[PDB]
Amino acid sequence: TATSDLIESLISYSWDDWQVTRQEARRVIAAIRNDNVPDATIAALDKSGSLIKLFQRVGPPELARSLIASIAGRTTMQRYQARNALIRSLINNPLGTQTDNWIYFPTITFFDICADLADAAGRLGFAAAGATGVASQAIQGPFSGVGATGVNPTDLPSIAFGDQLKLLNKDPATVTKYSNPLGDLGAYLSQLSPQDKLNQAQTLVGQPISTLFPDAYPGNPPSRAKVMSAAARKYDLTPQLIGAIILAEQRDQTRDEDAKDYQAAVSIKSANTSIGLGQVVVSTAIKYELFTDLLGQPVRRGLSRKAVATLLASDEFNIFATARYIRYVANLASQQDLRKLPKTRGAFPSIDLRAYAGNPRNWPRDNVRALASEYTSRPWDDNLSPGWPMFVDDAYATFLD
Amino acid sequence: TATSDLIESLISYSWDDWQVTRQEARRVIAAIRNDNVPDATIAALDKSGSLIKLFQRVGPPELARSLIASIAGRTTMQRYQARNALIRSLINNPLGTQTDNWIYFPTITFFDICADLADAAGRLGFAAAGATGVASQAIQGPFSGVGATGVNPTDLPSIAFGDQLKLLNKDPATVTKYSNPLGDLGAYLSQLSPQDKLNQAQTLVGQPISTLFPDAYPGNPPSRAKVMSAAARKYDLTPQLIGAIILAEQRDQTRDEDAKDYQAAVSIKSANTSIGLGQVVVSTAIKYELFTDLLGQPVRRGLSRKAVATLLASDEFNIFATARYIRYVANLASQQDLRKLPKTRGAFPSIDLRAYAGNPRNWPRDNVRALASEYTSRPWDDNLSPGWPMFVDDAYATFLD
Amino acid sequence: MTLTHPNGLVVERPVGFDARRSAEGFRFDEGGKLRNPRQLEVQRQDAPPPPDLASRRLGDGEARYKVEEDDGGSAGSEYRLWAAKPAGARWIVVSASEQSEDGEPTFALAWALLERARLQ
Amino acid sequence: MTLTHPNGLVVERPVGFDARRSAEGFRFDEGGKLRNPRQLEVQRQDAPPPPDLASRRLGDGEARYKVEEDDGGSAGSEYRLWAAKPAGARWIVVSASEQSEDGEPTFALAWALLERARLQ
Ligand SMILES: [Ca+2]
Ligand SMILES: [Ca+2]
Ligand SMILES: [Ca+2]
Ligand SMILES: [Ca+2]
Ligand SMILES: [Ca+2]
Ligand SMILES: [Ca+2]
Ligand SMILES: [Ca+2]
Ligand SMILES: [Ca+2]
């Protein structure tokens, strides 16, 4: 195709041309993204023996990520040829895309996450680009994590050696610095006006997702809002429920807590921390297969624990993980018997176990309040969080209006 | 040859047999070492096209390391042919031998080291199998390093993680733990009987060298004594002088210092520590080319800083480096103005600068003392170790008997 | 400051908690409307501990303990301490819970409550 | 105990070192017959430190410090310290030697001998 030819001249070597420069590489990735006939283009490049060449010559990992991601995401019936071509490319130089943030995804797996992700996004309706709504500049205190900030947890500097040490000794002044920032939840809400509350909510939802696979998307990455909508649809929730859960979490999250969240999960300890937007716990992600709707079974099976923890620091994966687990908790409650749950009926007299089976629009406000308890803690053990239900409930008010 | 044929059967593929068992490889590495016409065997293997097959088929790094080490040092005429075949077999950046301890040696670099080493031991006289003289069982405290122990620093477990951090934080109690174990040197010597002293000396010298290239030698590794002898001959010292410097080093050395010594040299810091029997500083090994006599100019140039720090933990390379550095220090002293070294002569008045140019047999004892000072510290800056001269002299007397 | 049950149990009340005397002893819930509040519980009892449980010196005496861990939520896993020391022929028991994201909690408080408890 | 030169300088001797005074002031060498003895030295200087000196906030005031490094022997590299602090019209200088294998030495003892050192 036209795009095939352009790429052939950009990657082809001549007597006076022996490298695919950094700029020709960018021209190549641009040409792939802006192509109207991606499948034909690739078959062409395969026919010419230049498909393999393309993967070997676009060189620095960051560029190989864009290339690999754009081709994984845009190509339907040619995916295999592309994938084979890439495998065949990894001999000699098997480093590929497996550097930096992507250190835990084997290059071939990075391809596969990108392909599945682009499929999911189109099929579930979050492929479309999002206006670049503004993010907070906070770097400390409540609401300074990725929710407020758009700064991805895997992009945060490593915790200094002094601190990692005090953090191993369990020195509380330090465990503070790096744990949940709020104590009195009620007291915190008291400081926010109706407007400040609204502003946060908009800050959270209006941003493009902080994603690790930006180029799996046809254009710019979607708004979080778009992604929450899509996840609400899949799990019979509402995007306002989801946002309330997440805003609650992001209020009780700091930038340092994001750092600790991620780095403790991929360090030797392989910690079972709660990560990302919705504060999903690593083992729970795996145990309940929270990526089911974005990743094929084959791909998920191969995922290391540390890869899963990295995926949770990608906004779309965390949003879907959060939504699916909420629909889990609600479901688990529909099968419960309220008689055997005395303290629960005590704390939320209007609670309605049957209604949980369906949409949150037909839920009593006490179903949200109770689910809030049973999200920050063990689901339906008759042990309730005293302060989280009012805290999630407030955020829900802000989203409902 | 008889040997080429046996090998040819052991590595040949038949119908429905296309793998070389681990048992087959061992018989091949065995058969090689038991060969009386190893040059003819090689040529008879290349004449069949079996020689490239050989290197291709023996795959696990531990066995490839034994096969390559063995052929590199039993060949003369046919050595280049084997090296040719090896390169040919390195198709697609295989691992080869470049795993584990040998991770800082590219496979051609491993072959090229066994070649020079095997040749160096024949030419210099340390090829012959040493008695399996026995090592100490100690795992901490003075005299528990490799000199006492036979346990290579590169086989030592990684330093516990909590500890790594404390070291990075320059924690006194922890640096204490991984540094020189001795404070008052005189006290140490008092608490030893002249018979304890004699046993440390025998244990140091009596053991087979702790070598990274065991199979480069015709049979078992030489004794440290044998290597020390060859090294004293080469630089016009005596093995007693070499021994006394090393024994004093090994007394102020523990297992935990052996681990700190190497791991800090090849961690991200690329540290400038003193490593191995003679406690040679990594940067000093390079600056003064302390392996000149075992490896050729080709091989040496290629060597990464970490390769050098890894060679420093190979007893024969260390002993040769140590001897060379000593002759250096002595040399640098024969070029000196005693009148411009007032502290030096104050402390060792019988010091005879001229006679440092010749053999230690003819040095005044005060010359061994002053050279000790100027081995543990800057050579000839007219600042002295107060303790190290009496400490090395004591080890010297023990060796002189 | 110092609580004295009618059955002999005397414990020191953890600073910052709601004291509330139960049947066999006391029950402390952490003050405030917190997301992840600590729940403590001392009581007296004639029976011995459940058969087989880790030991450990608790100051000058023994302590029979067990730490459960379960799935929780975004706040971490549920940790339940169960601890009993001998008070002569009888036993003082402490119970405790709290979520953690960062592995097993110290339970510093629950232990200082078992350690300082007494009968008479 | 607490040395006090005539020229105004009053320092607190480091445990285990040979107190020995020189014209400008004091000198400290480490007792024992050590392989790698530390060796400080304090003086009351007039002329100010050369321009290039780095800074660290030592105590409540600031310190102008220089740090040398040279090839040593098997005890590691030579490391000479150099630091001065505002002392009225003049300065109180600390001078400290040491070999090291593990990069630059902390100099805890050379800093404590400047933080404490005052003038009459
Ligand atoms: Ca080009
Ligand atoms: Ca949090
Ligand atoms: Ca968390
Ligand atoms: Ca619960
Ligand atoms: Ca076979
Ligand atoms: Ca040492
Ligand atoms: Ca050392
Ligand atoms: Ca010196």
Side-chain angles (χ1 to χ4, degrees):
Chain A
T1 81
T3 283
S4 153
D5 303 325
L6 177 64
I7 270 155
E8 236 117 19
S9 83
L10 288 176
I11 58 136
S12 95
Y13 292 149
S14 78
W15 199 246
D16 271 331
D17 195 357
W18 282 100
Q19 60 175 307
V20 184
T21 57
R22 193 173 200 81
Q23 164 169 185
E24 279 161 335
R26 291 190 215 101
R27 286 186 67 188
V28 170
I29 295 164
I32 290 267
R33 286 182 78 55
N34 179 89
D35 184 33
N36 62 24
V37 292
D39 256 333
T41 283
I42 291 288
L45 290 175
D46 183 85
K47 201 173 171 184
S48 310
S50 26
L51 193 57
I52 315 75
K53 291 181 195 138
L54 169 58
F55 292 116
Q56 282 148 14
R57 294 171 186 170
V58 179
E62 62 281 352
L63 280 175
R65 275 176 215 121
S66 300
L67 177 63
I68 285 153
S70 306
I71 293 162
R74 287 300 308 274
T75 67
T76 317
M77 42 246 178
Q78 285 302 152
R79 208 152 281 185
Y80 72 98
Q81 233 164 17
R83 193 177 182 266
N84 300 311
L86 171 77
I87 298 271
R88 301 260 289 312
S89 158
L90 282 154
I91 91 300
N92 275 327
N93 283 78
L95 203 57
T97 67
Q98 179 147 18
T99 97
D100 299 320
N101 310 244
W102 301 264
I103 240 173
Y104 305 90
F105 312 113
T107 307
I108 183 49
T109 305
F110 172 105
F111 182 97
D112 286 328
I113 289 170
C114 284
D116 278 343
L117 180 49
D119 288 342
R123 186 228 319 156
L124 304 159
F126 62 93
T132 57
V134 208
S136 157
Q137 291 310 301
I139 50 171
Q140 294 133 120
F143 202 60
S144 70
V146 61
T149 254
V151 164
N152 195 282
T154 67
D155 272 333
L156 287 172
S158 295
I159 296 169
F161 289 140
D163 280 311
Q164 299 191 221
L165 188 55
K166 320 209 195 65
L167 264 181
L168 220 67
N169 290 133
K170 296 186 180 188
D171 161 53
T174 265
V175 191
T176 285
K177 191 175 171 172
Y178 290 91
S179 200
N180 281 323
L182 302 175
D184 212 324
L185 305 171
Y188 173 67
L189 294 170
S190 284
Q191 244 77 42
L192 305 163
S193 84
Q195 192 51 29
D196 310 322
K197 293 186 189 185
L198 184 66
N199 290 329
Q200 291 180 335
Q202 202 165 310
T203 279
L204 191 72
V205 152
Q207 297 185 228
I209 58 176
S210 175
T211 179
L212 291 175
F213 315 97
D215 275 10
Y217 299 97
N220 289 345
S223 75
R224 297 178 167 155
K226 197 76 179 173
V227 178
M228 280 169 291
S229 276
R233 273 178 271 133
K234 183 85 218 170
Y235 297 103
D236 201 22
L237 308 183
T238 66
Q240 285 89 356
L241 180 54
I242 290 179
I245 279 301
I246 283 160
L247 183 59
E249 301 296 336
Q250 294 300 118
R251 272 163 176 172
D252 214 6
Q253 193 81 10
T254 59
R255 170 158 153 164
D256 299 291
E257 199 210 331
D258 268 349
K260 161 199 74 73
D261 273 349
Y262 180 64
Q263 292 168 22
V266 291
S267 77
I268 333 290
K269 307 190 304 294
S270 263
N272 199 29
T273 61
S274 54
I275 306 169
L277 288 186
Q279 296 279 287
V280 175
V281 179
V282 187
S283 261
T284 311
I286 303 162
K287 179 154 164 193
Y288 296 99
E289 299 196 299
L290 302 179
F291 303 148
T292 278
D293 289 77
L294 299 173
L295 304 178
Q297 189 171 12
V299 187
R300 278 152 31 206
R301 302 301 164 173
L303 284 168
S304 70
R305 187 190 173 81
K306 291 177 180 171
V308 156
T310 307
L311 284 186
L312 288 178
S314 206
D315 288 352
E316 77 280 79
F317 283 95
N318 189 279
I319 291 160
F320 268 76
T322 311
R324 175 170 159 104
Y325 183 59
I326 283 169
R327 168 44 67 193
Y328 170 70
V329 164
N331 276 1
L332 180 52
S334 63
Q335 300 143 20
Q336 296 294 161
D337 182 29
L338 190 45
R339 278 191 297 262
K340 280 185 41 182
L341 281 181
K343 300 191 252 194
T344 307
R345 212 190 69 179
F348 318 108
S350 326
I351 198 174
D352 178 11
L353 307 200
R354 207 206 182 178
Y356 273 137
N359 202 82
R361 290 173 344 252
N362 316 132
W363 292 3
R365 213 65 122 49
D366 266 353
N367 273 223
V368 170
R369 284 180 203 105
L371 176 159
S373 174
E374 295 320 64
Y375 178 97
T376 191
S377 79
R378 180 164 180 85
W380 317 116
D381 57 343
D382 221 57
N383 291 9
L384 316 167
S385 170
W388 207 243
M390 60 88 34
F391 196 70
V392 175
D393 184 58
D394 181 282
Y396 194 45
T398 302
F399 277 116
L400 278 185
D401 174 87
Chain B
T1 76
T3 306
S4 67
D5 289 345
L6 162 62
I7 280 168
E8 219 165 305
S9 116
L10 293 191
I11 61 166
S12 72
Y13 290 161
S14 61
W15 188 243
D16 223 3
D17 162 32
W18 293 281
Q19 199 224 208
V20 188
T21 59
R22 192 169 245 93
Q23 156 119 188
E24 288 179 311
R26 293 172 210 144
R27 275 198 53 80
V28 162
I29 306 174
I32 291 276
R33 293 184 75 83
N34 183 46
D35 195 355
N36 46 33
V37 260
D39 258 341
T41 281
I42 297 300
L45 271 164
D46 191 269
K47 184 111 174 304
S48 309
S50 309
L51 195 60
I52 288 164
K53 289 172 180 167
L54 182 51
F55 291 115
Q56 286 179 322
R57 264 128 235 210
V58 177
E62 64 262 17
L63 300 163
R65 247 186 250 103
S66 300
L67 173 73
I68 290 162
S70 302
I71 299 165
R74 312 231 44 226
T75 60
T76 337
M77 299 287 179
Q78 299 312 132
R79 178 182 272 140
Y80 84 100
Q81 205 144 76
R83 189 176 184 276
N84 285 347
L86 181 73
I87 296 248
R88 296 272 286 262
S89 82
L90 262 22
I91 219 309
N92 274 329
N93 233 338
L95 228 25
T97 63
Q98 189 161 27
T99 86
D100 290 329
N101 309 243
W102 300 268
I103 220 173
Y104 309 91
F105 300 129
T107 298
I108 214 45
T109 279
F110 183 86
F111 178 105
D112 262 349
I113 287 159
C114 304
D116 285 37
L117 181 59
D119 283 350
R123 184 211 325 150
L124 305 154
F126 61 97
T132 19
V134 132
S136 162
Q137 295 288 353
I139 64 169
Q140 16 134 101
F143 199 66
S144 76
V146 61
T149 241
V151 172
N152 208 292
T154 67
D155 285 329
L156 289 176
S158 310
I159 284 166
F161 175 71
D163 270 328
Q164 303 222 205
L165 239 39
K166 290 166 154 66
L167 291 170
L168 234 8
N169 214 61
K170 291 165 181 174
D171 178 21
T174 301
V175 179
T176 290
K177 186 159 162 277
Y178 291 86
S179 304
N180 295 325
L182 290 169
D184 200 54
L185 300 167
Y188 181 66
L189 284 164
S190 293
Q191 293 135 20
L192 288 196
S193 69
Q195 168 62 29
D196 304 347
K197 294 180 180 182
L198 185 62
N199 291 320
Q200 296 182 323
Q202 197 165 335
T203 281
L204 184 65
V205 171
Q207 309 174 220
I209 51 168
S210 183
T211 180
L212 293 177
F213 309 106
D215 269 11
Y217 299 97
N220 298 314
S223 67
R224 285 142 159 204
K226 184 76 97 161
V227 172
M228 274 180 284
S229 262
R233 237 180 298 124
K234 176 75 201 189
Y235 300 96
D236 196 12
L237 307 153
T238 60
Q240 287 89 3
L241 180 56
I242 289 180
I245 284 282
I246 293 168
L247 190 91
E249 288 308 331
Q250 290 307 104
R251 278 172 176 146
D252 217 4
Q253 188 78 17
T254 68
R255 190 158 137 117
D256 286 328
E257 195 204 340
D258 264 345
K260 161 183 83 44
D261 270 353
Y262 176 59
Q263 297 173 19
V266 298
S267 70
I268 312 310
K269 304 166 303 218
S270 276
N272 207 30
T273 56
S274 32
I275 303 167
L277 294 172
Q279 290 281 280
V280 179
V281 178
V282 174
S283 266
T284 305
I286 287 157
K287 179 168 181 163
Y288 296 100
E289 290 176 314
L290 299 180
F291 307 146
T292 275
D293 296 283
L294 310 166
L295 313 169
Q297 193 106 36
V299 210
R300 275 152 47 209
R301 287 337 179 183
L303 287 176
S304 65
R305 176 152 166 122
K306 301 186 182 167
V308 156
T310 298
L311 286 181
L312 276 198
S314 213
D315 291 355
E316 75 274 85
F317 294 90
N318 199 285
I319 279 157
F320 272 81
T322 301
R324 192 161 157 90
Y325 189 64
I326 291 174
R327 169 43 69 196
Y328 172 68
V329 152
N331 271 358
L332 186 28
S334 58
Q335 301 160 20
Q336 289 302 143
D337 210 325
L338 195 30
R339 310 188 322 257
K340 251 200 173 183
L341 286 164
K343 292 179 188 169
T344 291
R345 190 180 99 278
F348 320 100
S350 299
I351 191 182
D352 184 347
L353 290 194
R354 188 147 193 266
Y356 264 142
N359 192 95
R361 279 183 302 275
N362 304 126
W363 304 0
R365 205 61 96 70
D366 254 351
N367 257 227
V368 175
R369 293 193 197 98
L371 180 139
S373 185
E374 298 311 68
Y375 175 98
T376 184
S377 70
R378 221 193 139 91
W380 313 114
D381 56 356
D382 197 71
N383 298 351
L384 313 163
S385 179
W388 207 248
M390 62 94 32
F391 191 75
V392 161
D393 189 64
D394 194 282
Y396 197 42
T398 298
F399 275 112
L400 288 186
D401 211 42
Chain C
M1 175 262 188
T2 291
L3 305 159
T4 302
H5 199 279
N7 62 197
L9 192 66
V10 6
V11 307
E12 311 309 335
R13 171 170 73 172
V15 31
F17 279 68
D18 295 325
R20 162 165 55 106
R21 47 199 285 279
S22 59
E24 345 76 29
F26 299 102
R27 182 172 184 175
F28 308 85
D29 305 284
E30 182 165 23
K33 48 201 38 163
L34 303 175
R35 170 185 195 169
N36 177 25
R38 296 186 230 261
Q39 190 188 352
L40 272 42
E41 202 154 3
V42 214
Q43 34 210 271
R44 167 176 171 273
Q45 59 159 340
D46 300 354
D52 139 40
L53 282 185
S55 290
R56 57 165 276 177
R57 300 147 39 64
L58 199 229
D60 308 45
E62 358 162 334
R64 216 59 57 94
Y65 81 98
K66 174 196 51 193
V67 169
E68 287 162 26
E69 185 277 358
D70 297 277
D71 310 292
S74 45
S77 310
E78 312 283 356
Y79 292 103
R80 265 218 63 256
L81 174 57
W82 201 99
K85 81 169 169 182
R90 293 148 302 166
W91 294 80
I92 302 186
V93 178
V94 167
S95 202
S97 46
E98 81 188 64
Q99 291 177 260
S100 191
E101 210 198 308
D102 300 345
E104 198 165 299
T106 73
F107 281 112
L109 289 188
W111 288 116
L113 176 64
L114 193 40
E115 192 282 339
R116 295 279 205 93
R118 306 177 302 106
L119 296 189
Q120 184 218 341
Chain D
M1 167 159 194
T2 289
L3 287 43
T4 62
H5 192 59
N7 85 164
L9 179 43
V10 17
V11 224
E12 301 221 293
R13 203 189 71 176
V15 60
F17 286 66
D18 290 337
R20 189 54 202 104
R21 46 200 300 267
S22 73
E24 311 80 24
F26 290 146
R27 170 161 186 163
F28 299 59
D29 302 326
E30 198 165 11
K33 55 195 70 196
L34 295 179
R35 169 187 201 170
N36 181 27
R38 294 185 286 256
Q39 49 132 207
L40 329 181
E41 187 159 33
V42 196
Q43 322 188 10
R44 172 183 170 262
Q45 282 209 43
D46 300 313
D52 72 305
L53 294 203
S55 297
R56 65 157 271 174
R57 188 188 170 276
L58 180 61
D60 15 40
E62 90 137 348
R64 301 293 288 184
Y65 80 83
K66 171 60 195 158
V67 174
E68 297 192 322
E69 178 290 325
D70 286 79
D71 295 330
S74 59
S77 304
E78 299 286 337
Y79 286 96
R80 196 191 188 266
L81 174 57
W82 210 101
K85 78 168 185 173
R90 314 297 194 263
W91 289 271
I92 297 189
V93 188
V94 166
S95 175
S97 273
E98 191 141 353
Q99 286 187 248
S100 189
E101 210 189 274
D102 306 330
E104 196 165 288
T106 76
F107 291 110
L109 310 190
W111 286 132
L113 177 81
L114 203 25
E115 198 172 43
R116 225 69 154 173
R118 194 162 147 181
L119 278 193
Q120 167 50 218

Coordinates of all heavy atoms in Angstrom, one line a residue, chain A residues 10 12 17 19-21 24, ligand 1:
Chain A
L10 N 12.0 4.2 4.4 CA 12.5 4.8 5.6 C 13.3 3.8 6.3 O 14.3 4.2 7.0 CB 11.3 5.3 6.5 CG 10.6 6.5 6.0 CD1 9.4 6.9 6.9 CD2 11.6 7.7 5.9
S12 N 14.7 0.9 4.7 CA 15.7 0.3 3.8 C 17.0 1.0 3.8 O 17.1 2.2 3.9 CB 15.1 0.3 2.4 OG 15.6 1.4 1.6
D17 N 23.3 5.0 3.2 CA 22.3 5.0 4.2 C 22.3 3.7 5.0 O 21.9 2.7 4.5 CB 21.0 5.3 3.6 CG 20.0 5.7 4.7 OD1 20.4 5.6 5.9 OD2 18.8 6.0 4.3
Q19 N 21.7 3.4 8.7 CA 21.0 3.3 10.0 C 19.6 3.9 9.7 O 19.4 4.7 8.9 CB 21.6 4.3 11.0 CG 21.7 5.7 10.5 CD 22.2 6.7 11.5 OE1 21.8 6.8 12.6 NE2 23.2 7.5 11.1
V20 N 18.6 3.4 10.5 CA 17.3 4.0 10.5 C 17.4 5.0 11.7 O 17.3 4.6 12.8 CB 16.2 3.0 10.8 CG1 14.8 3.7 10.8 CG2 16.2 1.9 9.8
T21 N 17.5 6.3 11.4 CA 17.7 7.3 12.4 C 16.5 7.3 13.4 O 15.5 6.7 13.1 CB 17.9 8.7 11.8 OG1 16.8 9.0 11.0 CG2 19.2 8.7 11.1
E24 N 13.6 9.0 11.4 CA 13.0 8.2 10.4 C 12.1 7.2 11.2 O 11.0 6.9 10.7 CB 14.0 7.4 9.6 CG 14.6 8.2 8.4 CD 15.9 7.6 7.9 OE1 16.5 6.9 8.7 OE2 16.2 7.8 6.8
Ligands
CA1 CA 17.8 5.7 6.8

